[PDB]
Amino acid sequence: MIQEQTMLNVADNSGARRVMCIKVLGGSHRRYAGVGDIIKITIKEAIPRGKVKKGDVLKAVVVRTKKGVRRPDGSVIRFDGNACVLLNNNSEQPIGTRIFGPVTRELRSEKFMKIISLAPEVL
Amino acid sequence: SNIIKQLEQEQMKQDVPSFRPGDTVEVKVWVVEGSKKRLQAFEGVVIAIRNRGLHSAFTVRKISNGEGVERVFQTHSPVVDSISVKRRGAVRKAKLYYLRERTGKAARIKERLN
Amino acid sequence: MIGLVGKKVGMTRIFTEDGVSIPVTVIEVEANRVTQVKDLANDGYRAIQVTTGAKKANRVTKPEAGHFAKAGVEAGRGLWEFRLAEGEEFTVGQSISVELFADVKKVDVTGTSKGKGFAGTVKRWNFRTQDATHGNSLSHRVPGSIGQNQTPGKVFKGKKMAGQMGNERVTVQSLDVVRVDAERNLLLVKGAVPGATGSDLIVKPAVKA
Amino acid sequence: MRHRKSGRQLNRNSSHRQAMFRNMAGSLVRHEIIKTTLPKAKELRRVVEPLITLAKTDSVANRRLAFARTRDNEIVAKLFNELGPRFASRAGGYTRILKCGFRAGDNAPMAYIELVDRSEKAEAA
Amino acid sequence: AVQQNKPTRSKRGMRRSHDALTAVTSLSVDKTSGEKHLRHHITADGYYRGRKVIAK
RNA sequence: CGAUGUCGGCUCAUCACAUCCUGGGGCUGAAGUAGGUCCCAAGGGUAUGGCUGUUCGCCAUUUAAAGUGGUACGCGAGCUGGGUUUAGAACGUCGUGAGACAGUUCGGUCCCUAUCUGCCGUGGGCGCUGGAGAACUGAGGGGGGCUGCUCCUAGUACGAGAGGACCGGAGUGGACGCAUCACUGGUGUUCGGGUUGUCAUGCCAAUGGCACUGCCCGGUAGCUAAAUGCGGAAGAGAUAAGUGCUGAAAGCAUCUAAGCACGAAACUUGCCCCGAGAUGAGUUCUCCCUGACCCUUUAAGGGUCCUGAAGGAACGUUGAAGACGACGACGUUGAUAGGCCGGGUGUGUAAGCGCAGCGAUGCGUUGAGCUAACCGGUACUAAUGAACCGUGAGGCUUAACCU
RNA sequence: AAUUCCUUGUCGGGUAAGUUCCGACCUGCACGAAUGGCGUAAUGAUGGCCAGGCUGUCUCCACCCGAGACUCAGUGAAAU
RNA sequence: ACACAGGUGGUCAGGUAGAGAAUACCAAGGCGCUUGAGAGAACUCGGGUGAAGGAACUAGGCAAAAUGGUGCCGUAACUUC
RNA sequence: AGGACCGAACCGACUAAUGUUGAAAAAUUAGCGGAUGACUUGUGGCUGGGGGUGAAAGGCCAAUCAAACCGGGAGAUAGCU
Numbered sequence A: 001m002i003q004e005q006t007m008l009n010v011a012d013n014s015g016a017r018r019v020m021c022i023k024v025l026g027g028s029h030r031r032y033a034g035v036g037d038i039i040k041i042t043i044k045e046a047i048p049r050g051k052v053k054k055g056d057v058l059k060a061v062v063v064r065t066k067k068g069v070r071r072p073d074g075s076v077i078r079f080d081g082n083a084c085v086l087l088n089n090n091s092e093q094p095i096g097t098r099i100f101g102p103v104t105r106e107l108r109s110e111k112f113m114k115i116i117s118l119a120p121e122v123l
Numbered sequence B: 001s002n003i004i005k006q007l008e009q010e011q012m013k014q015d016v017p018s019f020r021p022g023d024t025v026e027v028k029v030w031v032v033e034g035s036k037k038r039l040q041a042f043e044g045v046v047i048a049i050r051n052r053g054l055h056s057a058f059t060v061r062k063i064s065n066g067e068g069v070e071r072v073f074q075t076h077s078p079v080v081d082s083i084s085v086k087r088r089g090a091v092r093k094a095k096l097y098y099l100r101e102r103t104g105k106a107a108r109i110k111e112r113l114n
Numbered sequence C: 001m002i003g004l005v006g007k008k009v010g011m012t013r014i015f016t017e018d019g020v021s022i023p024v025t026v027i028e029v030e031a032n033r034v035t036q037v038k039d040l041a042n043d044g045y046r047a048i049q050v051t052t053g054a055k056k057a058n059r060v061t062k063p064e065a066g067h068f069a070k071a072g073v074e075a076g077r078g079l080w081e082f083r084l085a086e087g088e089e090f091t092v093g094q095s096i097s098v099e100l101f102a103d104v105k106k107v108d109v110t111g112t113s114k115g116k117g118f119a120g121t122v123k124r125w126n127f128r129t130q131d132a133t134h135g136n137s138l139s140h141r142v143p144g145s146i147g148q149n150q151t152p153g154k155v156f157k158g159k160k161m162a163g164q165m166g167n168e169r170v171t172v173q174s175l176d177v178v179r180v181d182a183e184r185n186l187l188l189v190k191g192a193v194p195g196a197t198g199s200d201l202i203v204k205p206a207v208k209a
Numbered sequence D: 001m002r003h004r005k006s007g008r009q010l011n012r013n014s015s016h017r018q019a020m021f022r023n024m025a026g027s028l029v030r031h032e033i034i035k036t037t038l039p040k041a042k043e044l045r046r047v048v049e050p051l052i053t054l055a056k057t058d059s060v061a062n063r064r065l066a067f068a069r070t071r072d073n074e075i076v077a078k079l080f081n082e083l084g085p086r087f088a089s090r091a092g093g094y095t096r097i098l099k100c101g102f103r104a105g106d107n108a109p110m111a112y113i114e115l116v117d118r119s120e121k122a123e124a125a
Numbered sequence E: 001a002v003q004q005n006k007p008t009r010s011k012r013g014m015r016r017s018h019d020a021l022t023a024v025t026s027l028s029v030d031k032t033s034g035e036k037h038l039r040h041h042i043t044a045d046g047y048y049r050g051r052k053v054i055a056k
Numbered sequence F: 001c002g003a004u005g006u007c008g009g010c011u012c013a014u015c016a017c018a019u020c021c022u023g024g025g026g027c028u029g030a031a032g033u034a035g036g037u038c039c040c041a042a043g044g045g046u047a048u049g050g051c052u053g054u055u056c057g058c059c060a061u062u063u064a065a066a067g068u069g070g071u072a073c074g075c076g077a078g079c080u081g082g083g084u085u086u087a088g089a090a091c092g093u094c095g096u097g098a099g100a101c102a103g104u105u106c107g108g109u110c111c112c113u114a115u116c117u118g119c120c121g122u123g124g125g126c127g128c129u130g131g132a133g134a135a136c137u138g139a140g141g142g143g144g145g146c147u148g149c150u151c152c153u154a155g156u157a158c159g160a161g162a163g164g165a166c167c168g169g170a171g172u173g174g175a176c177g178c179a180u181c182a183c184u185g186g187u188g189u190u191c192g193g194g195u196u197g198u199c200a201u202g203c204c205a206a207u208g209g210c211a212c213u214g215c216c217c218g219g220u221a222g223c224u225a226a227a228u229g230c231g232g233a234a235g236a237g238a239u240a241a242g243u244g245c246u247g248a249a250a251g252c253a254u255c256u257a258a259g260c261a262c263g264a265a266a267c268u269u270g271c272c273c274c275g276a277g278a279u280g281a282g283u284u285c286u287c288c289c290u291g292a293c294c295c296u297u298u299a300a301g302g303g304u305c306c307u308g309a310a311g312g313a314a315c316g317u318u319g320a321a322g323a324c325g326a327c328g329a330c331g332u333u334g335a336u337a338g339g340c341c342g343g344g345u346g347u348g349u350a351a352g353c354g355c356a357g358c359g360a361u362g363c364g365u366u367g368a369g370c371u372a373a374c375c376g377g378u379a380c381u382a383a384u385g386a387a388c389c390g391u392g393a394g395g396c397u398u399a400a401c402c403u
Numbered sequence G: 001a002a003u004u005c006c007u008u009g010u011c012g013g014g015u016a017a018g019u020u021c022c023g024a025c026c027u028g029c030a031c032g033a034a035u036g037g038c039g040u041a042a043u044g045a046u047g048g049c050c051a052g053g054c055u056g057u058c059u060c061c062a063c064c065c066g067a068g069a070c071u072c073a074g075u076g077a078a079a080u
Numbered sequence H: 001a002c003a004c005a006g007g008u009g010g011u012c013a014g015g016u017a018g019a020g021a022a023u024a025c026c027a028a029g030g031c032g033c034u035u036g037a038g039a040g041a042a043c044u045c046g047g048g049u050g051a052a053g054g055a056a057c058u059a060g061g062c063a064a065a066a067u068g069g070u071g072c073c074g075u076a077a078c079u080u081c
Numbered sequence I: 001a002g003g004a005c006c007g008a009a010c011c012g013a014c015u016a017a018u019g020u021u022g023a024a025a026a027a028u029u030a031g032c033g034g035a036u037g038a039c040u041u042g043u044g045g046c047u048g049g050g051g052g053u054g055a056a057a058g059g060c061c062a063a064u065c066a067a068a069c070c071g072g073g074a075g076a077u078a079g080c081u
């Protein structure tokens, strides 16, 4: 349950470390993004020699949130923080080449198959 | 109520083992893995139990890759295939929410042993 | 097709073989007993009137009792009509059970919604609150402007204002029928329906798809 | 809204209500009949009758529990020595409300509330 | 906010058209003491439904 | 001018249409995709931020779109008070000076308990022609009316290629709306526990008061959104712009003059709610009432005695109903409320005693004790036998049956 | 620039985006030396700008405890 | 002007905790403030708790939230030292 | 040592809410500044209206001071309402 100004950690080796959500994509007046949703981000901290830089403006898919995901029998899976994976602005495909921490099967899209394969763990 | 009670207990599992907050629990869950259907383990500490007949639930907490993962199970869901206690833990509270501020060495839980 | 009268028991869930939890309202539907058939010749329209339940003799007024006696049925907790379709036909004193829905895929459910008393515009009409701070004086959940100026010099009918909320007829449409069981007087529908536990419900096959 | 809630607020806060019914519950036990406003008399049953129920089983813990709810060892002593045994075999309803007038000074509806099998000797002593 | 015009004695009376009191219609007589009393209330001498329930 | 408060914002809106998006259509310098322009169309929908008092504007990022205008440049007896007309102060500039600026700068009191209209809700009265209880009919009124992306069709039509559809069908979302509390959660000063200082219950032990519920950790019922169900439609009628058929006036031609077929999110229906004060007060089923007298100005007259129904209401116990009224349940032939029993739930192993330890404390008895609004039961308490209103067969005329 | 009309000057920095801010330029409408000029550690309920923490300020409001509001009884105003 | 949350100089200084004349709880002493009873709607006032987010609010972080003791370790530019 | 630091009494009055036919003709609550000094305060004294006093705001001089209050010239004058 991510909105504008929200800060997210980063679940890849893109070099970003902290990003801010500056837009929830996918509809007029849309309020929140959750696991599986794409956001627009600015990069607030990045490592020295990575694929991206501080102040760069791009997209990312949310892959872990504190609000969690509901499953069909009523269950909940919650994470201790909010993380995302950086995506090319145009192709919306991953910038990084590795993924860190657990992800959820909600990502099983044509689009995010690469993220679940790379993920250490899939919940 | 009777009607509901009766609708609810014909759906209730009969062999839920006994476990309690602070115990370490392994829950085996049914999942669809691409085009497969298999059991997947999820092991962690019981930090909360909701006793409510058919609507019973419990929250299991574990550490994956430095960061916490909490899973709330609906005890009577057919998604939950089995539950087994891996170790019996000694705590006083019913709800161990304080463990969320603790990590590694601080978050350990003595063994009950009795 | 006709509908039936029932009682809202409460909500619970059905778990499915493959992990879905269906939330269900439990509706109690006892036999509906037909207390008057209306036809074109006598009434100008076609309909059955039904009762269901049971009622305390000492609470059944004489007018009420003559009407029941006429149909040859015991008193029930009330009377409700259901319009008939061409070819639909019933007879006085006939019993209609919940198996009427056996092969109805969805139903509309009508109830009297819970009462929230006198409600302010924030809750009743989702108005937004003005500032909690920044100098606001005595005006946080209050309604704001209720009109323009000299032209029109009046407040318009329909203006959203505070007043009674709930305790009214509400129909919720196209709920899935999850189970029908006449031996237990049960109908389970997927989802929430209007009303408090205990209150009457009208169930009709869905007018939509 | 108030749906399905119990407990009268009596234009008091929570700690005042509790001190008040603690006093009023002692008054009833001591005198076996008192007069108060109809709504306080009706709330009071919910405080005095669980005391009498408790007193049906004499034990240190039940005495202490009653002491904690009354803070008056004369009252707990009468509960466990006299009232517990009186009502040994009565399944509840140890009190009775008798409606009476309207108070002169503010027109409050009044009532007597008394212990069911009332002792007039106890009342005068 | 205050009136621009003085309301009439007519209007005052209309406003008051719901102010009249209701006389009590449910007095009973205790069958033992002979006292009048509000229904479901005790009598002044402390009788109720024929029993002396309160010495006072 | 014996006062009509100014810009902008917030809240709440309402109308126009010169239409921003969605819908229909003609032309295109329209291959497709995507555009341009005009016509028809007002049903719904129509962005968050950075800067600035800003409106506007530039900028960032969204969106199907981020419309233009009227409403005292809508809206201060609804809020704000940043801009802007008071008094303080300073800078530049002008003036000998007091001072001035339509230059700038820091600071700088926003009242009103709603009588009438209006509006949102909710009652009382009477009426509807004897009275009464229900169930209705449906005139009229209101609500709703938005849309993305993906897939199949189809890598098809089109195209040198790059790309890439119409028509039609499936799915899944954004915003919005209603309902609900089963799930996930919030709250839960009425449940349980831990704990600091102090005071008391004689003391130990156990408890209670006060200190924001002293401070906290949890949490039942209820309420509730972030939770999870459902909705917008399809269909039908008549149309707009527009497309045509047959066809003269006018040997031809012509959608039109006669005749005929189509045609849109607008209109009428279809969906939801109110609804017979619809005084044009409607319909259906059922229930209740079967005594005399007097008087005058003799008439739909006035009164008296006897009667007092159906029903309504009153009183009481009350409700997921409620400001009050109202509305629902119940009143001993009784579960209406309280208690009480059992259960659940929550808390998390009480007290006492015993053991271990110098002691703090640990262990056992023990998943103990306590447990609200919950579930299932139970007449222990309280719901009185009765009085109040409402009557006593219901107008005239004509017609149709029947005497 | 507490001084600059043109003006949101231009350039640089910070921000995803900065009419404010900081640094620089000089084209000073209309700075300038006790009408004191330019600096200045410390001080300041002083003006402008930024960040961490924090949060019901806000997205967007929910529940709860209390005093009113509502009902009964007693007293009993006001502006107009 | 009121039996009015205002104003009014000096003196005295008990117990526990505490640096204290702060603060909390008490003692001696003095009081519950001269309309009460119910109810448990909107809205207003004064408070408590709050999922995810965390200044996105606004002229402006206004108001809230937060920090908060003692001891020791440690502490930058700049400086009139 | 100090117009030194933190902080009650005491002196003040930066912000906000409330109140605005108030509890109050300037307050109340939560916060705020000074607190050995150019400090604060009791009693009494002196300065008087074109006059006083003013760390200067045209501030204050008995609840409205760019000329106090009372009485008088006085029925000032009012080409205005």
Ligand SMILES: Nc1nc2[nH]cnc2c(=O)[nH]1
Pocket: C058, F331
């Ligand atoms: N006491 C009493 N009981 C009833 N039961 C049904 N109606 C009534 C009534 O009016 N009074």
Ligand SMILES: [Mg+2]
Pocket: C079, C080
């Ligand atoms: Mg009905």
Ligand SMILES: [Mg+2]
Pocket: C114, C115, C116, C117, D001, D003
């Ligand atoms: Mg209600």
Ligand SMILES: [Mg+2]
Pocket: C128, C129, C130
């Ligand atoms: Mg807002």
Ligand SMILES: [Mg+2]
Pocket: C137
């Ligand atoms: Mg104010």
Ligand SMILES: [Mg+2]
Pocket: C136, C137, C138, C139
């Ligand atoms: Mg306020």
Ligand SMILES: [Mg+2]
Pocket: none
């Ligand atoms: Mg106005």
Ligand SMILES: [Mg+2]
Pocket: C153
């Ligand atoms: Mg007019």
Ligand SMILES: [Mg+2]
Pocket: D011
């Ligand atoms: Mg009161």
Ligand SMILES: [Mg+2]
Pocket: D015
């Ligand atoms: Mg307290």
Ligand SMILES: [Mg+2]
Pocket: none
């Ligand atoms: Mg208790």
Ligand SMILES: [Mg+2]
Pocket: none
């Ligand atoms: Mg005037």
Ligand SMILES: [Mg+2]
Pocket: none
């Ligand atoms: Mg047009």
Ligand SMILES: [Mg+2]
Pocket: none
């Ligand atoms: Mg043109």
Ligand SMILES: [Mg+2]
Pocket: F042
């Ligand atoms: Mg429009």
Ligand SMILES: [Mg+2]
Pocket: none
């Ligand atoms: Mg665009």
